[PDB]
Design brief:
The structure is cut from a larger assembly and holds 8 protein chains of 8 kinds. Chain D is of the alpha+beta class. Chain D contains 4 helices and 18 strands. Helix content of chain D is 19%, strand content 33%. The two termini of chain F are 62 Å apart. Classes of the chains: A alpha/beta, B mainly alpha, C mainly alpha, D alpha+beta, E mainly alpha, F mainly alpha, G mainly beta, H alpha+beta. Chains B and F meet through α1 of B and α16, α18, α21, α23 and α24 of F. The structure holds zinc ion. Chain F binds 2 RNA strands through α2 and α4. The PDB classes it as ribosome.
Chain lengths: 164, 56, 22, 272, 134, 645, 80, 127
RNA sequence: UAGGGAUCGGGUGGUGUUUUUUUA
RNA sequence: GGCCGGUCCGGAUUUCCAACGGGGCCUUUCCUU
């Protein structure tokens, strides 16, 4: 319906059916899922075993996905459940890694990046999340660092300036 | 279920097919680090159990 | 209030129209 | 302890277990003396992490304000340890209730580099980054005695010999030195009249400890003047913080009292 | 001399409470500039009223860039404009009462501060050289 | 060396020659170079020439995979498959089994003790690795006892006293060698290394290490193929050590093979009943392929091949029912595969085939899309191998089981005592005749309103795909043929019915009117063109040509090209059919241009009619221009272009 | 006194000056105000520096001060 | 002044007055490399890179190993035959301390520079 | 070399008294 | 290199999973410059 012109996968058709299902349940949404489009989705497991769906959106609709993102992500975490899902941008290059991290985490925040240089010559690259949404944020941090790992090559550890 | 409640309505033979007298099982599960936090909480509880021995 | 009668190039357009009409 | 804590035996050349919580190095660690399966470590997350090797897992973590330099367990109590951290005081922690560091030994002026117990289990020894070691009783929280010499500098590793009589202080200028623990006693066998006399007036000093000139004599030492200046200006700024806190406590509705032992804890995983 | 500055936050996908679009911001900006508002004032008005954090982080480009991009740009930079009109006001005041040697000292300092960014602006050539004090 | 350091360094920006092809080079090189006498010695000697100084774990690990590349080259070409390499292996096994008062000494610097004594042992460990994969040269009919008894006393040392580098491969060799009956000393070595792996599991505080996993595979082989397995309480301890590791299935694998082996040898162990519970748990919830499958294998072998309590043997099926609703979309499919294996390879199938039928019906009515196909397949396999009374009560509950009754009628018909199925079809005909009320007319009215849930419809379309009563069904099929896919299925059913047995004009006009106001629509268009060729002959032909001109968005344009291809006397009937196909003479526009070239290729009278139609289109352009010039959207005549670009 | 020069306590971070922290930040905050003439929402800065006027019911909402702008006596705000 | 130079003055006199942690901003990448090699040789301890958007703040934690860092102004070329005389007139003793050079193939001290057999222009020194 | 007590100018927060209340 | 039958009671057939390496290759498509 609203994909890019390449032939999708069957689970892409299933999540597209979820999209047209939310469009069938129309008049609670403010015609928000009329200008949608995605280039491609791709799903990949984490070391925890469960999978994650990177959906690449051609970026007027990263900001077009404005306040609809939370409602539709709990909607499709009910419909195509148990697989952690994320929306991403696409193609110096530190800027594009920065931006894909910035929308990769959530529309929540990041508040600071550290990288400590140990005495063995290694480095540890920490990113620091906001203070909020933590009961659903903590459930997906290893997924976030796994998808940043296999989407950048870099190594990143997420943490919150909180207890855990 | 809705299908079970629509089917098993008339006949007396229910104790052969309607074995589902108990609710479901097998949660999602929880993710890896949260499972780690839970069972190491259990580890801290059994460790405090095993040194409350040494208290006396 | 704090609008300006200067400082913009459409304002140099209106003031060149001023300085050629007067 | 390295970039991640590894458990291995001497029979195989690979780490038998990873053990870390996450991506943070492990600055020191120490096994237990009894319940030998349990151990503790300190990471540069300003964090204490206890591990149990029966379950082969870390088991709790607390985060404090400043970085913990060195742990040492108790030989006698077996579930109490001492952390030495970089704020200038050592912390006699429990293990079973890690939310109240049940003693704070305070009288230092710089970072406390290591610590260990006496083998008799009631007298601990801290060596710190200022050029002075000092020996604490367990149930006081202030210095029993200060040892320093002009040639020792930045004393890093102080340990207690296995007969509770000598204090080995390895400094930063290279030298490792011996000290007595009870600095007035001597190490020969004594005839029983000498033993009865020294023990007699030991008990006598103990019961007349609070007379106000026995106390000044038994409290008088001679510290180097760097430590003297740092201790007295630490005293005047602590009095200033206490006074300004008293003013806020006079005005404001609810600035609740926190204990001195609970002050330095900034967090604890597994709240109960 | 001390410090008195704003500290713009670490965030740059700002600010997630912004219901408004990114085109009405440019519409409000060109409205205020063709009302005749200097870059600083249009920035502060849509910061307070139609609350943006800053337009350089809500829109993808600073407001001088979007003023040039909508054909509304100034002919002299804002700092040189404000400092020039301060110079002409203090000159008019000293012309009125010529005994104010404190205003003379301040006018010398103001003209030196004019010449500083004037020769800076000649070296970067935003306004063209041969330019010396209108 | 320095080129490798500069290739893996960091202050080194770029070049095109970056990826190190040397690791591939040697595995391509020793194919030719396997003299295995002299040049292979000149391969392994510069290994030691750096392995006598100092080597970190990084250099060690890349050298270990470099030796793996050597061994892969030997797997490709093994130059002599007769024992000249085996004597070479045995050879390297034998190889890897007051004066200071005058002495000025200046610029003093101490050396370190690491240099000799790490390299005293590490070279031996790597030689044992290289050599022992060289013994896992796997070529059949080259393993004899007379071949291998020279090597047993060497591997019996580097099994015990090795420290972890080669042990995993030495007992892999013993897994390969457990088939061949060796001498008595060597069978004692087999039992001795069984005690060794028992002590390995006794010392290691994790079974999810590669050492314990490989040793579990060795104990799997030792359980399966020897004369007398023993130390049964010891292997019960081993299994009790295994069971808390199965919270994390991660290359356990080998461990499940161990479970397979002792559940095949059928030893009564009371902890296996908890092993079955945890393997059912990870069988559903585990989020990998093939680990769920081997867990299905072990759980199924336990459930079919061990005993059970007479309440527990149905309690596990109650667990099967409770996992039939599982929220992920593949663990449920693994549940379906195990239920398939339950129904296949018994009176247990009859005893459980009522609850299983009801649960498979509820899983057919589930929400997962590709699992519904497996639900249909398992429902068909459960209905076909069912008993008499079980299938009778199943069809009774399916008949009696309003949209619930519709879905149950559709499912019972899809599974479908053929006279009893026809009686169910009679009740379904009572449903179907009441299941045609103004729906296609409402669909046409919605199409006209647009130009200004079909559940029973899809169920009756399924019943029509299953099927004077059939003639009345074909009449109702025209009523719903004349919800887009529902109308497409109705059109497919009516096309099949009209191919089976004025009416053609009405059918073709209702087919054409649906395209104006899909692949199934293309099939119905081909069927309607077949009916138009089978067909007031010239009047209906002019009606079809007028319908093609009214047709001539990509689907309707393809329908117009298909109708013109079905139309193409050659032009005496096609005079009134090129009124729009020549008017068209943007990838859909490129395909329409290809369609116009197709219509132009597929003739003197046709060319004359085409020239007259071109003049008529010029006349129509003149008439539209005259209407416009008499009317004269000034800025609207450019607003379209200014809004397009 | 003696502070961990890395990540300190939040009680000290909210205490020291907004420049002098390890990573600087703002301290003003946006907030939704209801103009009491016609009840509809507008956002407003805290150190608002100018007299905002809710153009729907154009009364006045906050007059500025040297620091935080005080709000006009019938207004109602949500911090956000 | 320079950006490496005042950071080195900071971590010099701060441990001269005997502290354990220092702060240094603006933390350019040459400062990163310069104290990267000194924690490689064990003269400071671990160090954190707080990264704001402005320039970054390096926080070095250090023990009492070090006594003097220092930069050389200006940064002029030296040969393999020159680094020995520069270690002579730049360090107190010979086999003690290091001299840090921006070499062409990396950023290293004098012993790894003469080990990889390269050179470059002199940068700074630490003993 | 650092620390402390004030004091002036601005700001933030607290919550008692001087203050007041539909004129700003 | 491991996991699955189906030919017969351990030699040939096969699916999937990993590790290397091989080939076509996805992104200046609209524009003076
Ligand atoms: Zn209003």
């Amino acid at each position: 319906a609203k994909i890019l012109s390449q032939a999708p996968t069957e689970l892409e058709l299933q999540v597209a059916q979820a999209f047209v299902e939310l469009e069938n349940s129309s008049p609670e949404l403010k015609a928000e899922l009329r200008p949608l489009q995605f280039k491609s989705i791709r799903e990949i497991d984490v070391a925890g075993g469960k999978k994650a769906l990177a959906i690449f959106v051609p970026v007027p609709s990263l900001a077009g996905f404005h306040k609809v993102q939370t409602k539709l992500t709990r909607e499709l975490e009910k419909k195509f459940q148990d697989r952690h899902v994320i929306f991403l941008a696409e193609r110096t290059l530190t800027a594009v890694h920065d931006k894909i991290l910035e929308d990769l985490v959530f529309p929540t925040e990041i508040v600071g990046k550290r990288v400590r240089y140990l005495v063995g010559g290694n480095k540890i690259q920490k990113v620091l999340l906001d203070s909020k949404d933590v009961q659903q944020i903590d459930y997906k941090l290893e997924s976030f660092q796994a998808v940043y790992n296999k989407l950048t090559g870099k190594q990143i550890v997420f943490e919150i300036p909180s207890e855990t | 279920t809705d299908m079970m409640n629509v089917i098993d309505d008339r006949q007396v033979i229910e104790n052969a097919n309607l074995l589902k007298g108990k609710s479901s099982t097998y949660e999602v599960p929880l993710p890896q680090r949260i499972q780690q936090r839970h069972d190491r909480k259990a580890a801290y509880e059994i460790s405090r159990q095993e040194v409350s021995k040494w208290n006396d | 209030k704090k609008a300006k009668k200067d400082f913009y190039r459409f304002q140099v357009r209106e003031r060149k129209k001023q300085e050629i009409n007067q | 302890g390295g970039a991640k804590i590894h458990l291995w035996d001497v029979n195989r050349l690979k780490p038998v277990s990873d053990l870390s919580w996450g991506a943070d190095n492990i600055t020191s660690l120490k096994f237990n003396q009894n319940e030998t399966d349990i151990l503790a470590s300190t990471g540069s997350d300003n964090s204490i992490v206890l591990y149990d090797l029966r379950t082969n897992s870390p088991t709790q973590k607390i985060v404090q304000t400043m970085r913990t330099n060195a742990i040492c367990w108790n030989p006698m109590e077996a579930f109490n340890f001492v952390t030495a951290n970089e704020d200038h005081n050592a912390y006699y922690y429990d293990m079973r209730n890690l939310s109240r560091s049940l003693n704070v030994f305070k009288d230092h002026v710089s970072a406390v580099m290591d610590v260990d117990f006496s083998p008799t289990g009631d007298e601990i020894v801290t060596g710190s980054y200022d050029k002075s070691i000092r020996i604490y009783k367990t149930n006081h929280g202030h210095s029993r005695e200060i040892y320093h010499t002009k040639r020792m500098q930045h004393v890093f590793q102080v340990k207690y010999s296995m007969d509770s009589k000598y204090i080995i202080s390895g400094s930063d200028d290279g030298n490792v030195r011996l000290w007595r623990s009870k600095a007035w006693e001597r190490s020969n066998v004594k005839t029983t009249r000498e033993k009865n006399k020294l023990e007699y007036d030991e008990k006598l000093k103990e019961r007349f400890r609070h007379m106000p000139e026995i106390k000044r004599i038994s409290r008088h030492r001679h510290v180097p003047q760097v430590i003297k200046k740092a201790q007295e200006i630490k005293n005047i700024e602590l009095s200033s913080i206490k006074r300004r806190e008293a003013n806020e406590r006079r005005t404001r509705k609810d600035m609740p009292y926190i204990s001195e032992r609970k002050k330095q804890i900034v967090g604890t995983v597994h709240k109960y | 001399k001390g410090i008195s500055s704003s500290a713009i936050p670490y965030s740059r996908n700002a600010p997630a409470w912004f219901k408004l679009s990114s085109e009405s911001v440019i519409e409000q900006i060109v409205k205020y500039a063709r009302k005749g508002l200097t870059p600083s004032q249009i920035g502060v008005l849509l910061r307070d009223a139609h609350g943006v954090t800053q337009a350089r982080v809500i829109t993808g480009n600073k407001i001088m860039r979007i003023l040039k991009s909508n054909g509304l740009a100034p002919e002299i930079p804002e700092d040189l404009y404000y400092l020039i009109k301060k110079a002409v006001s203090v000159r008019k005041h000293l012309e009125r009462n010529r005994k104010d040697k404190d205003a003379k000292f301040r006018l010398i300092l103001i003209e030196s501060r004019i010449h500083r960014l004037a020769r800076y602006y000649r070296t970067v050539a935003v306004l063209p050289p041969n330019w010396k004090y209108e | 060396g320095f080129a490798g350091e500069e290739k893996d360094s960091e202050n080194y920006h770029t070049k095109v020659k970056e990826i190190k092809s040397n690791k591939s080079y040697d595995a391509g090189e020793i194919l030719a170079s396997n003299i295995s006498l002299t040049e292979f010695g000149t391969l392994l000697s510069p290994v030691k020439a750096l392995l006598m100084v100092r080597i970190n774990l990084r250099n060690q690990n890349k050298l270990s995979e470099l030796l793996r590349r050597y061994l892969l080259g030997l797997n490709h070409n093994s130059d002599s498959e007769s024992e000249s390499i085996l004597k070479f292996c045995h050879q390297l096994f034998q190889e890897s089994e007051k004066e200071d008062f005058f002495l000025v000494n200046l610029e003093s610097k101490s050396y370190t003790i690491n240099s000799n004594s790490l390299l005293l042992n590490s070279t031996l460990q790597k030689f044992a690795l290289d050599l022992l994969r060289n013994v896992i040269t796997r070529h059949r009919s080259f393993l004899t006892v007379s071949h291998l008894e020279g090597f047993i006393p060497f591997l019996r040392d580097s099994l015990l006293s090795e420290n972890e580098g080669v042990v995993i491969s030495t007992l892999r060799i013993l897994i390969t060698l457990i088939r061949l009956d060796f001498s008595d000393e060597s069978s004692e070595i087999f039992k001795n290394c069984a005690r060794k792996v028992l002590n390995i599991i006794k010392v290691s505080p994790s079974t999810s290490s590669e050492l314990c996993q490989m040793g579990l595979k060795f104990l799997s082989a030792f359980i399966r193929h020897t004369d007398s397995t023993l130390k049964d309480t010891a292997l019960s301890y081993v299994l009790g050590r295994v069971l808390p590791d199965l919270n994390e299935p991660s290359r356990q694998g080998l461990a499940f093979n161990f479970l397979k082996a002792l559940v095949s040898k059928h030893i009564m162990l009371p902890e296996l009943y908890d092993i079955a519970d945890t393997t059912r748990e990870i069988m559903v919830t585990n989020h990998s392929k093939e680990i769920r499958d081997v867990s299905r294998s072990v759980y199924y072998q336990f459930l079919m091949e061990y005993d059970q309590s007479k309440g527990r043997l149905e309690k596990q099926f109650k667990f099967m029912v409770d996992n039939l609703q599982y929220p992920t979309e593949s663990g449920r499919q693994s549940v379906m595969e195990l239920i398939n294996l339950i129904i296949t390879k018994p009176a247990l199938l009859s005893k459980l085939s009522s609850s299983f039928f009801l649960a498979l019906v509820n899983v057919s009515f589930n929400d997962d899309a590709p699992r519904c196909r497996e639900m249909a397949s398992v429902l068909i396999s459960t209905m076909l191998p069912k008993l008499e009374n079980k299938d009778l009560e199943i069809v009774e509950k399916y008949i009696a089981a309003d949209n619930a009754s519709f879905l149950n009628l559709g499912l019972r018909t899809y599974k479908v005592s053929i006279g009893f199925e026809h009686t169910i079809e009679l009740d379904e005909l009572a449903i179907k005749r009441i299941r045609y009320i103004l729906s296609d007319t409402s669909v046409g009215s919605e199409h006209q309103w647009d130009l200004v849930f079909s559940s029973y419809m899809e169920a009756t379309e399924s019943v029509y795909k299953h099927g004077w009563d059939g003639i009345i069904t074909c009449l109702l099929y025209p009523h719903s043929w004349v919800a887009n896919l529902v109308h497409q299925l109705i059109a497919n059913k009516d096309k099949l019915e009209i191919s089976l047995t004025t009416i053609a004009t009405r059918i073709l006009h209702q087919l054409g009117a649906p395209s104006i106001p899909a692949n199934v629509s293309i099939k119905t268009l081909v069927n309607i063109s077949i009916l138009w060729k089978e067909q007031t002959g010239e009047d209906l032909k002019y009606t079809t040509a007028i319908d093609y001109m009214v047709t001539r968005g990509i689907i309707r344009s393809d329908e117009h090209r298909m109708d013109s291809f079905m139309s193409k006397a050659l032009l005496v009937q096609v005079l009134d059919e090129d009124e729009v196909i020549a008017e068209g003479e943007y990838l859909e526009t490129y395909y329409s241009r290809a369609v116009d070239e197709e219509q132009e290729e597929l003739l003197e009278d046709k060319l004359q009619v085409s020239d007259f139609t071109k003049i008529y289109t010029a006349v129509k352009q003149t008439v539209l221009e005259r209407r416009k010039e008499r009317r004269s959207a000034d800025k609207k005549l450019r607003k379209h272009a200014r809004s397009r670009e | 006194l003696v502070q961990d020069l890395l990540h300190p306590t939040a009680a000290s971070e909210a205490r020291k000056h907004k420049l002098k922290t390890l990573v600087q930040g703002p301290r003003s905050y946006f907030l939704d105000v209801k103009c009491p003439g016609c009840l509809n929402i507008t956002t407003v800065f805290s150190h608002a520096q100018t007299a905002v006027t809710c153009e729907s019911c154009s009364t006045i909402l906050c007059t500025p001060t040297g620091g935080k702008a005080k709000l006009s006596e019938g207004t109602s705000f949500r911090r956000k | 002044s320079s950006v490496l130079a005042d950071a080195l003055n900071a971590i010099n006199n701060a441990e001269k007055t005997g502290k354990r942690q220092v702060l240094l901003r603006p933390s350019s990448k040459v400062i990163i490399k310069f104290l990267q090699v000194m924690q490689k040789h064990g003269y400071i301890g671990e160090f954190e890179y707080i990264d704001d958007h402005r320039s970054g703040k390096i926080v070095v934690q250090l023990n009492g190993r070090l006594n003097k860092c220092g930069v050389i102004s200006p940064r002029f070329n030296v040969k393999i035959g020159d680094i020995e005389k520069w270690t002579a007139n730049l360090l107190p003793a010979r086999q003690f301390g290091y001299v840090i050079l921006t070499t062409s193939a990396g950023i290293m001290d004098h012993e790894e520079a003469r080990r990889k057999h390269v050179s470059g222009k002199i940068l700074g020194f630490v003993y």
